[PDB]
Symmetry: D2
């Protein structure tokens, strides 16, 4: 499949006790495919609360997402972990499920050297035989990969490019300049327009599973050169995103899904599991102003 | 005058002993006006080696720049300093010289509170009666001003906006959204295109006093919606800028001015005063590839 | 048991394939008890490569260490995780093994609020009924808990104090002023003397695996006010630690164990699994100079 | 003179208009010598609000302090600046006054290379013929010099050691190991005990202006190995310092001086020039609790 364009970073529905709610998770997937009209899903990312889950849970989410989506859309499986043996086990499972590409966060917590980082990517690829997308998220991992280092990663022909949840647009431009055949997916939804202006190939975003219509319009208008209109739509989206961030990101996207009848459920502990009354009321105001 | 568009951050020619070379400084000003075709000059900024100079030297530079440029172009005088009494003295002098606006760096070194910062801006404005442009450069000062704080600064009607040498494009978009009548000048030349895509009103840049032709083309093509062409010109400019940064920023821009017959002189100690042979040869290669 | 004094952060022996080497792990435990004469072991900390391992592997390590040590020394089980359900499962298992206290890293990766972090500690305690030591390691997690926040955690009376792998000695002194009955274990071996001078109750350290004799001397001499002699031993200790850090921290402590007959094995991928030959020779030099 | 021991970082008395109050500055100097019984004064440091002042004002302060103190105590002149020609002019003037050593902050604001920083120290020394103390204050300048780099500075035999306003006690111990004949003055008053335990040669501190008696006791008791008694005095000291930091550091030390009859005056804009009335009462509480 084509891996360009708009990918929601899939949110997962949890029950009160923190178990996966399969019915809810399917409604989320269905909603992204049918109503947000995404090109694909990025499953197991930070937005899916992935790092708070067990390996078996992560497998269940991969299985459920793929069974619901089938081949209607492109699917990318984020399998990265500080535990390389887990990342390999997950990448094999996702590959056998038919995921179109793997993705892996740079290994974190410990301060890994660049050679260790590369060996981690190469090891997942060798064990799975699947494509790989580097998942770069410096504001969470503390890891900053430079132009020449991405090029060493790109010496492995199964590495397709980078899910770039980073805000350095000089680095962004330089990666496009040096590796014009490798892909970049912008990761910060509130900076989609300036990333689109630099020729990114698509975007992966949490807010796309409620705002995926505007997200597509910004992306398409910008790359068609209609910046005045793309900018307008970016301004309204950033009103919504500022609202969502203030109110509590994952819970608030989930609340916005609930207001459209998607049983998007609780967040997983240790995240706060549920919005207070006041925050529910604020999310309803966001819905009325921006998504109704 | 109109303060929109392309402003070179003026470089200053020094002699071997660190004194200002007036003939050189005039040739720099002349070159920006006549060959780079800038809309204005930003005098006394970080690029002018301002923070390594005495108050009397800074005054001489203001006097010389204004006497050479006259009213051919817009002139902005950066007068900020950890010493508020110096900043007031400089802002008065620049105002009496006819500078179109003042600008001041956020006070630095000490960790000033936001109220102290605002009192500094308001004090300069009250003493001078001139317009003020906030000079925000977090990667040097460590000071990060937020949307609501810019709005408190903008309660003073003589504050025109911000010289934004910062790379947070979410903040950038938010400032345009909240204060659509206040101006923003992008400060990172290697990120001009994505800043132009968000509707900045112009740019202040060191590299414009050798690359001000391409800088204008990126700015105009982007805001006319021709992103494919603006992107191309941004890629070549960033090859040049990457070169310049690797070789030594201020010295290398000065070397590029010398290759066009501008006596751009030495840098001021404690900066390295002169390029080595090897670095001169590299700057000549930059000239041959990008500016000939 | 008395939980004061010298605790080695237990290293784990791995096979070439990343699996646990039980014989090797047992010999490490024995070497600590019998040769390093430690007061206890801190098991499953960052030093034990814990965050690269499966839930089952962590349990296996808890089981082995307890089996070897029996009740000859104190044992603390680090059970913290970004996965709260994992932390609870591990905390219950270590509690059933008869671990003298649990400990848990502040939840990391995601940017959790202080209420969420407190809820995480309280939930582990509620589920296990065991003592809890907060594991604070800001340079790996980016989380910095302040004096008032420690006080809120200390409202739970099963919270004993803090494994303070942190370098702020004003915070350290302030915690002892505020909470004089709560314990502190210093976590930077190379700053043992100044931490001991502030009246910490013990220390938890990776290098105590090989240098536990000097570590006890620094600690005991410092608390007796014999600073001249403590400082001497700290200088030699720090020559060794500087060499260990330059050569590769966990690999080099393992090599130093191997040089004494202990089957300390490989590191676990994605860490580099073995030293280069050059670095093996360097560990031999350290052994000859500092440990023979 | 012997440059070891307890040095207050001299505060400066300002008038309402920001000018120097000579009578007030003289009374501060006298209070230090006569009541705080300091070994010396560190004049023109960050504590003296130096970086907010003109060249002439700095000279006036050097002149006054020397005039009052004569040879009753040691005197060190902080003459560092981003302006090297300024540092040289000040260094020559303080040397002509008979200052026992110069000192200079690492050049800041710009991102200077280590060679440029060394050239700056060497140039000041060459121009003045006086001793030099490196002033290291990473939390204000962002500059962190490492052990090998200190060694390169120490190749100049007029470099005596370092005013270490820094909190890394591994670096501290490593500097004493490597350069045992070079001096270190600890610069964080609230970490005096652990610094003294590592064998620093003295301390330079703003709070010594009002708490010099306890500061000498902590320092002397620590070096005698009377840690229990040193720690007590450090706890009380740190109750006072925590209150001073919460209330506004330089203003509150000035208020505490005023409460003893010393005309310590205002702070200099852009610092807040005087305490709110509420905070004046709070300084009175500190005085009653800690200093009467
Ligand atoms: C950490 C995070 O949530 N990042 C989001 C963003 O879409 C982000 O939520 C949004 O731009 C607001 O910050 C995307 O990059 C997708 C992603 O990294 C993920 O799977 O979490
Ligand atoms: C610190 C600095 O040089 N900034 C330049 C940039 O133009 C910069 O030189 C360029 O983008 C490369 O980093 C501009 O922001 C202008 C400026 O701040 C200045 O006066 O120095
Ligand atoms: C991160 C780490 O390894 N820290 C060690 C230290 O002993 C450290 O290895 C030593 O001070 C060298 O920096 C201890 O704090 C124990 C600990 O946190 C651990 O199990 O990792
Ligand atoms: C930045 C500052 O004020 N530092 C003081 C300290 O004494 C400090 O005020 C005190 O430890 C409270 O943090 C000393 O290091 C002396 C010094 O650097 C100075 O003159 O500012
Ligand atoms: Cl970032
Ligand atoms: Cl390519
Ligand atoms: Cl920035
Ligand atoms: Cl406005
Ligand atoms: Cl207590
Ligand atoms: Cl020495």
């Amino acid at each position: 499949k084509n891996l360009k364009g708009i990918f929601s970073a899939l949110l997962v529905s949890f029950n009160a006790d923190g178990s996966i709610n399969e019915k809810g998770l399917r409604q989320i997937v269905r909603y992204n495919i049918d109503k947000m009209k995404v090109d694909g899903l990025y499953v197991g990312g930070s937005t899916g609360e992935n790092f708070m889950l067990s390996t078996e849970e992560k497998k269940e989410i991969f299985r459920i997402a793929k069974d619901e989506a089938k081949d209607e859309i492109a699917l990318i499986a984020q399998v990265g972990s500080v535990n390389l043996q887990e990342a390999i086990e997950l990448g094999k499972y996702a590959t056998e499920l038919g995921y179109d590409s793997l993705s892996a966060v740079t290994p974190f917590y410990y301060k890994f050297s660049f050679p260790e980082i590369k060996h981690y990517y190469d090891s997942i690829i060798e064990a799975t035989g699947n494509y790989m997308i580097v998942y770069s998220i410096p504001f969470l991992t503390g890891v900053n990969i430079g132009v020449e280092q991405f090029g060493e990663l790109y010496k492995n022909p199964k590495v397709l490019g980078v899910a770039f949840t980073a805000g350095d647009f000089y680095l962004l431009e330089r990666l496009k300049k040096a590796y014009p055949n490798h892909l970049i997916w912008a990761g910060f939804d509130e900076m989609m327009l300036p990333a689109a202006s630099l020729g990114v190939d698509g975007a992966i975003g949490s807010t796309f599973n409620v705002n995926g219509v505007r997200a597509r319009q910004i992306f398409e208008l910008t790359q068609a050169g209609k910046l005045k209109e793309a900018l307008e739509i970016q301004h309204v989206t950033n009103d919504l995103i500022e609202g969502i961030l203030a109110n509590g990101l994952y819970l608030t996207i989930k609340e916005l899904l609930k207001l459209d009848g998607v049983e998007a459920g609780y967040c997983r502990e240790p995240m706060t599991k549920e919005l207070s009354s006041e925050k529910v009321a604020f999310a309803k105001e966001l819905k009325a102003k921006y998504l109704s």
